[PDB]
Design a binder for these strands. Sequence first.
RNA 1: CCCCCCCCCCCCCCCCCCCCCCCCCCCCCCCCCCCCCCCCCCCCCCCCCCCCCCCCCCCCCCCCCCCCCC
Lengths: 351, 368
Amino acid sequence: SLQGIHLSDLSYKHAILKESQYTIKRDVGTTTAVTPSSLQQEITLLCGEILYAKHADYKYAAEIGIQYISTALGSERVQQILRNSGSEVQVVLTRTYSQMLDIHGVEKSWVEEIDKEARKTMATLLKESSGNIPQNQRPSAPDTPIILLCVGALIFTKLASTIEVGLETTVRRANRVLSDALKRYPRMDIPKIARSFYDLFEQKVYHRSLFIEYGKALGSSSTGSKAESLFVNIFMQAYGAGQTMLRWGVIARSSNNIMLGHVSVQAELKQVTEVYDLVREMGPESGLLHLRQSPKAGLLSLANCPNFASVVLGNASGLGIIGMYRGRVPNTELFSAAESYAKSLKESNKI
Amino acid sequence: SLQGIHLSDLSYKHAILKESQYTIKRDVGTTTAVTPSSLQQEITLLCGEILYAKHADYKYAAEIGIQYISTALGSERVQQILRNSGSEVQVVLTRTYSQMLDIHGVEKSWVEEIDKEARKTMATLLKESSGNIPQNQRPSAPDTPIILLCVGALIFTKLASTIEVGLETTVRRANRVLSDALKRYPRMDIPKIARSFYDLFEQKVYHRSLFIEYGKALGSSSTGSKAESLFVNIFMQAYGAGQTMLRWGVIARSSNNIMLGHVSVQAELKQVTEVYDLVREMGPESGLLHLRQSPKAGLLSLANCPNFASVVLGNASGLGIIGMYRGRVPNTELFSAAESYAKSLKESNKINFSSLGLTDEEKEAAEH
RNA sequence: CCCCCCCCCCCCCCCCCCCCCCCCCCCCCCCCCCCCCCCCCCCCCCCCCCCCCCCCCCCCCCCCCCCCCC
């Protein structure tokens, strides 16, 4: 008889963020550098120069990476992407001078420093090598911009946490992942390059969705480079951004944690369901919402269900996944219980 | 046999408020300021100036915030929104003089005061800092209008209660929420800024739906600011506006409060159902109805079911949610009963091995 | 390889119909009382609350098929 007492609030909450026929025009005066497709070889060399020598400053390292993306996506197709990201920012086509590159926002002095320092290192090494430097070790190698962007991809994954946390993870993984790249360019300062990328993603927010569009575009192509196929694979491990709680939620169900049967947790079932059903309603873009720093994101918060969150985290702790997750535990009691069951489950073998 | 005795009155009540082919033209002579998109940098600076220094008067602080929304939404797209909100109010495009901003309705004297006072504070501080003030601490920082609007967002949530209640909540939450903004602009007078916003939302009612449209628009964009993503998240916690009773109603069902089974409560079932079914009939706009101060709102009243309301509130009291809710309790008897059950429920720990769907070898180990 | 026999068909008888019988046929207007409807009560609202935070390149073996007869 008592049916009909139900509000699908979360769906309506999302539905309201679609009804906006009006469009936001933020970043009214802003200008960013774009490189035409024609200058892809020149920007490739500059990328290689950053990796090849141990430089004094790695401030614009990230902007150079974005400039390669620019050449790869389109001379002027980039403006379209940026305009469509919600930012009304204007683009500036980078020119040539004497031969060098004049990148908008990038100090001419910095460009010259990077070039000068790299040539100095090439001369020192060519004397030692007895005039013999193979193609794969030169800043001219075509995969050098991809290598640069792969460091950016690693900081892109940890955009969900501290500027600091990301640098740890970036360095650790870069050692295993960019193993061979580091063999050829041992002078690449992963921490400084990764810092330039964090600074860039934080300041030029529109470059987050430009990076996503490069990833999406690269993911589509028939033939990719060995370096390119790595980039996308780093980008994929970045999909469950800020939604670590929902994925650990399915893990709690898969573990059949008896704490998910607790009366207080049972009470939150409808809210939990609503969140997972919103993911399905939003489809594929749902995952990278947090990564884009989208205001829409956060509707996928499990704040409405603290007892469920407690059990999910407990289960993760018991299975030994939790690691360094700072996520607050509302019900300490439920957490400990879920943890105990999961630890007993962990050891036990059944068919 | 006697089943055809049924009137779906509440649906018809709503249906009548759709049949209006005729449209109301209120605010016949009224004029409000709009800022063209071109002046977004100038209004950004002015917003920062409000936060940056401790000012004498924060009267027009809210109107300045609306002016940033104006630049963000559209040079002239704003007039469309206001006209479509039901208000026949006319817009006035704000100009420049010498360089300053001439905002319609905003005293030139006030604009100059805010600017003057901010420059004075910048000079005092630059002497102390030894000429070193980082970008993030200057009134020029691009997130300053968003910060200003976030104080407005907090007062927007508590538009359902007193001008007073809202200020408490705004101040409390602003301290935790705008934590870092306050670090850079410690001179921002949250209570005066929040008061300007309450006054504005109460006087210029059309600005309520303009704020909603900014929120809706911001919620849609691909890349938002850290400040922008906060604004929408404040705006979301504002969705269940004035409908606190219906949401606590679902909580009473989720708690499986045995008082919802009382014969007198059972009698009100059809009215209760009618209200929740009207929410579904109205869809997403249903929630923000009370927030818009829409005359349509109030059809979502649980006045028709006093015994149910009593149980819902009792259950909320027992679970310890009720807090500072002034909502009248018609049946004191039912309330106390629902409260007792909910308090007993609150403490009690039980396990549904029925819900989990485990093997009786996993259900075996669970008993242990 | 396949195929390999035998082999016209038909052939009787036989008109059909033929009786009887018009149908219908009674009765019968309908209507007819009472009766305005309404009548109470009722502004709604009122609490709390930014989210996020772990880890993780993938890949890595081996392999022509076919092969008779008719």
